[PDB]
Design a protein around this nucleic acid. Structure first.
Lengths: 82, 95, 68, 73, 93, 110, 95, 80, 92, 110
DNA sequence: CAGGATGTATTTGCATAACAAAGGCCTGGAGACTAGGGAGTAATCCCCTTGGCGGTTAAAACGCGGGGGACAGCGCGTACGTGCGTTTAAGCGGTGCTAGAGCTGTCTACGACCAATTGAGCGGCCTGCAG
DNA sequence: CTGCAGGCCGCTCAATTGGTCGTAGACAGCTCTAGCACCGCTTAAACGCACGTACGCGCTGTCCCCCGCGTTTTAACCGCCAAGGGGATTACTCCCTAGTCTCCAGGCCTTTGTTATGCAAATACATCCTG
């Protein structure tokens, strides 16, 4: 059983992403808001990948199932599949 | 000789934009994926490549969001990012 | 002018090696025996192929001329 | 212009025919496996003429084609 | 000489909930566009599921999965409950 | 849960009002697949009917909110928004003469 | 004996959020559609319902943009809408 | 004909803005709004025309407008 | 395994930049690319055939699909090459 | 194109490099249609090949900007963005290890 | 100037390819061949689309003054950034176990297909009433 | 009062029924991949602290651009008509593409032993932010 791995995303990890996006100054409240958003984005993707996996009556989620999960979101992951 | 505030920030913006690798730690991310997955079903597994695919999607997502967030703050005549700047971007995006 | 001198020798070295039934590894190892400084077959290959810098070819050439 | 045969290849050529023909209905896949092992079990003297023939073929090949180089795609 | 509409079925469904409530022809036009939109999407995803599993047939199972992928939350759930029932029942005596 | 599985009309046998036999035909066409199962159009018809009912139920309530006894395109629009899950499903749909919600922001007030 | 500025504007927001009627005049709209169409081909025709179908989409589009635009101005701590507020919303939307 | 972008009057723009919750409109908005509307129309019309041409016909139907909108990530109900 | 275009992508690159190589990952990106575009064009072409009540997709449907999917001039060059390739193919 | 009618393969007949015969085959699957024409895969293969070339050309240039002799996912990513048209077609595509453009707004600078 | 700290260009070894030789096997592609249903052509009729016409009148254009809100500038407080030293667990490599993915072959309940049978729904018209 | 609604007739063709036929998917059974759990060790990244000031916030005052009416001008809308161009339907005809079968060309496997070939490390200049 896993718990609270949302805190496994360190402040630096968030900061670095924000920096890549052009962010220079970050409010201490951002870290929590960012986490809420990440979690939802990630959760929706996983759920669809799991749903596809379940339909196929399999146990292991494949990278291709993640790709399908993204495809429907209007996104693609090149280099991982079709 | 300490570099004044903002010198590093510009270097870090520059540097991460230039780089191509991951910014989020792998094991922490992998666990986050699973913690969430456990709420859909027990005893689920992932290919190592599936975890990588998820992380790649997540970082790309957050970076794009931060860029829009940054623009919102700029429009507001600020440099520091507030939670609301994120929310505005998401709202406009229909998220 | 230096480029040509090195090109000419590299061609001669390759021909000499082949004629005498030696490998590139043999040249590298023999230079070790002769001068105390060992070279890999990669270096020898790159020498014959002129894929090395001028200074590296210049430092190595004398040893290879003697090897022949 | 093709590549000259190495020590193993010169030898395996002789044994290719000495296995393919003497032991009929055997796949080349199987012959190659066996010949690989058979070569490894040869003494230096047994390998020698093939090792030197490979040298001779390489020298001869280059003599016939002075500018020949190995370039794979 | 005309494509079939669902206006007769939409009308009937309305009255089973609000038997004293009428509906305009324009509203029916909206509902007909609606039914075709949902149909198309589910059938579309069902096609993908069959494709992903290298199949040629769509069954009640693909429709079920397709519903979950397309619909959110509780609506997806009830749609699944009713669909599951209708089929479980369909093949029953 | 009916005891009547004898009905010839597939929609009736399925306990549905929607034209199951047609849904079969529609799934067959459009090249969604090469083969269509027996339970496929049944499952789908139930889904289409369920969602249809939910919109109409909520729209009927919208009509009442406006003190009316009829559904018009506007009442359908209000119904879609009132139900958050329904809103998402149809959140990108433009409704002919649907109008918008009466959303007034506090910052615009005196 | 004027209603104070902002009184009517607020009331009009309320009223336009109640109506379903088209706001853009029909003939002017139709003509705009045609002149645009001529950039692809002349002597082209449209069904009368096609023009109305297009207008419904156009108004819905602009209103949705105005809502996001309004949020941008609010984020800027003000009421008045500037071209920038439109551009920010569009950028975020990916237009 | 030409100059139909002026056919979208200030009131027309304003009323739409009002429906969206806008109280105050800068004089610069009217022109910016038009630029945006025009682009929307160009993309939708062009595709509707493209579909019409594919069908080897001359009249654009409501359905062709619908398909043009469909690829913008939108649907329109009540027109087919 | 699955069909890929790694051999074709490699060759196309060298017709443009004969002295430039390409990583296996980049090839993976290009394989995703070809599959994506293929699906989209075939998908739209399917709609065109469906909409006009046809059972066959021909070069024309592809042409229309290309115009709808590709922007600007990029679309034109694709159309020109497509039109030509068909012309050449049958003109033999 | 070629000045000859002679061909050895369908692709060589078209004058294309892409596997035209396969494209035809792929179009028969996925249930896009019941029937596929002969000119369809020829037309399509040319399109796929053309677009492929454009990305690769620009990526080769991106590789040059970095003084490299090799295309990597990053170079493909830069190529896509620099070309406005490709930046729409693939505008929303995530490239594994593609990175982002080095864009910093003036307001963030001294 | 005058020093400290970071970033490119330019050289080196470590795996790991591609070729040689032989010939049986795989399978994908190209080349014919016929069958028959899809798409193309021409002819026919009738809808709706365009265009023009004149009159009414709601909406738009324009002027004007008032004042509410955008804007710039000022000053104060703090939360954000910047190092520094200490602590954490992420990452690496290697070990060992087996659960589940993937492939093969059997065979059989299912769906496509056809021809015969049947009545729920289409179209138009009658007729009067609710929003 | 327009447009909604149920009732009526008479089809009429889409739906239902009941059989044959072949095969896509269910099912069991075997192989062995890669996913999981675990341990130890190194060390880059993370945690927490103290200190300083650049940025965010609120307040004040200036003035200028937008709002709210009143009056005048515009063309949008309404109802009406006539002309004819294009869309829909129909029958008839050809010929393109699925479906089947035949046969060939190339690539694959398979082993050691050269010649490269493509990079992660090392090392020497440039470049930059304070004195």
């Amino acid at each position: 059983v896993l718990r609270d791995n949302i805190q496994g995303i360190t402040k630096p990890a968030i900061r670095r992403l924000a920096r890549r996006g052009g962010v220079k100054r970050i409010s201490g409240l951002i870290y929590e808001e960012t986490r809420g958003v990440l979690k939802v984005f990630l959760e929706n993707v996983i759920r669809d990948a799991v749903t596809y996996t379940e339909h196929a009556k399999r146990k292991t989620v494949t990278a291709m199932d993640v790709v399908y999960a993204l495809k429907r979101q209007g996104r693609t992951l090149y280099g991982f599949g079709g | 000789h300490r570099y004044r505030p903002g010198t590093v920030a510009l270097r870090e913006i520059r540097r991460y934009q230039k780089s191509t690798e991951l910014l989020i730690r792998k094991l922490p991310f992998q666990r986050l994926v699973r913690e969430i997955a456990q709420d859909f079903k027990t005893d689920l597994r992932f290919q190592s490549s599936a975890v990588m695919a998820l992380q790649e999607a997540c970082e790309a997502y957050l970076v794009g969001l931060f860029e829009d967030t940054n623009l919102c703050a700029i429009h507001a005549k600020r440099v520091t990012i507030m939670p609301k700047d994120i929310q505005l971007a998401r709202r406009i995006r229909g998220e | 002018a230096l480029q040509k001198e090195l090109e000419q020798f590299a061609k001669l070295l390759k021909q000499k090696r082949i004629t005498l039934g030696y490998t590139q590894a043999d040249v590298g190892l023999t230079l070790g025996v002769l001068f105390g400084k060992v070279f890999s077959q990669t270096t020898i290959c790159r020498f014959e192929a002129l894929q090395l810098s001028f200074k590296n070819m210049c430092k190595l050439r004398p040893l290879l001329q003697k090897w022949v | 212009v093709k590549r000259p045969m190495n020590a193993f290849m010169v030898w395996s050529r002789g044994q290719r025919r000495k296995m393919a023909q003497e032991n009929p209905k055997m796949h080349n896949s199987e012959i190659s496996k066996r010949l690989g092992a058979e070569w490894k079990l040869l003494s230096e003297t047994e390998k020698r003429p093939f090792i030197d023939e490979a040298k001779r073929l390489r020298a001869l090949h280059m003599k016939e084609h002075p500018d020949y180089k190995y370039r794979p795609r | 000489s005309r494509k079939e509409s669902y206006s007769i079925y939409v009308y009937k469904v309305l009255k089973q909930v609000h038997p004293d409530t009428g509906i305009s022809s324009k509203a029916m036009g909206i509902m007909n566009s609606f039914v075709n939109d949902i149909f198309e999407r589910i059938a579309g995803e069902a096609s993908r599921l069959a494709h992903y599993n290298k199949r040629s047939t769509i069954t009640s199972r693909e429709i079920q999965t397709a519903v979950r992928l397309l619909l959110p939350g509780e609506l997806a759930k009830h749609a699944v409950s009713e669909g599951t029932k209708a089929v479980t029942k369909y093949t029953s005596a | 849960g009916k005891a009547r599985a004898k009905a010839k009309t597939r929609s009736s046998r399925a306990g549905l009002q929607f034209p199951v036999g047609r849904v079969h035909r529609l799934l067959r066409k459009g090249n969604y697949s090469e083969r269509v199962g027996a339970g496929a159009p049944v499952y789908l018809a139930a889904v289409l009917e369920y969602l249809t009912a939910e919109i109409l139920e909520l729209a009927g309530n919208a009509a009442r909110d406006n003190k009316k006894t009829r559904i018009i395109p506007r009442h359908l629009q209000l119904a879609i928004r009132n139900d958050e899950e329904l809103n998402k499903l149809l959140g990108r749909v433009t409704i002919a003469q649907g109008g918008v919600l009466p959303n007034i922001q506090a910052v615009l007030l005196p």
